[PDB]
Design a protein around this ligand. Sequence first.
Ligand SMILES: COc1ccc(Oc2c(Cl)cc(CO)cc2Cl)cc1C(C)C
Length: 253
Amino acid sequence: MASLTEIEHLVQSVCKSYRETCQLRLEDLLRQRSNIFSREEVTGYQRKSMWEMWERCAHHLTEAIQYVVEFAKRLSGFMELCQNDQIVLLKAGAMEVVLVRMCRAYNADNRTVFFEGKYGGMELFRALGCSELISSIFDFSHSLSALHFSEDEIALYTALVLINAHRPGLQEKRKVEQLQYNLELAFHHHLCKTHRQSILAKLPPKGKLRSLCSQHVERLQIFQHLHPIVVQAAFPPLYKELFSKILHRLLQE
Ligand SMILES: COc1ccc(Oc2c(Cl)cc(CO)cc2Cl)cc1C(C)C
């Protein structure tokens, strides 16, 4: 099943779905690299309360996750899976896709990330009280930056992050296995055609994205135990559904 012509069509389809669902174009991010937060603006972020900084980060992640949902809806074969499996895949993989997409907003030259209109280092997030998780995220983005991914490679790699037939709870595991296998062929065919197969051994182990997502859920539990009413009243509903139904509504639209 699936011939060479069909594999190449899938490559172009995934790349197109990714381009249409990017929050900001790569060119926009690269053109902002000299726009760095001043020492006074960094101090301002560090002086914010922990709950206000958490709310700002949860809002930005929720917006990023909305683009990932749209990417999934446009992904060939995803809407053909049952709704149980669409929700299982998105609950487990949406944050993983956001964390990979984040390398596009990361500048390896000065270790800064584009956040709220300017580039800032890890120290910008000190008020969160989760230095280990923030350090891990920056290290992860640095590791991806070292691969020099093209937009097409991020599109194919993120499609595989999402279409993972090993997620617990899948009712139609074989159908997800088939889609995953076609996407693996599409990704490996593209790498082979562009002489980029050397990146396969340099991609992060699957346990790496899993540990970042588990650390996020653990830090959110600590924060929610200290500020339960802040989470109830001021965190985005989609964020609480995934990490603490909206997903079903987004998938129906
Ligand atoms: C996975 O958890 C994350 C992920 C990111 C995060 O903070 C960031 C946000 Cl919202 C945006 C950018 C630039 O796009 C970079 C970082 Cl480090 C905080 C958390 C926790 C504290 C909610």
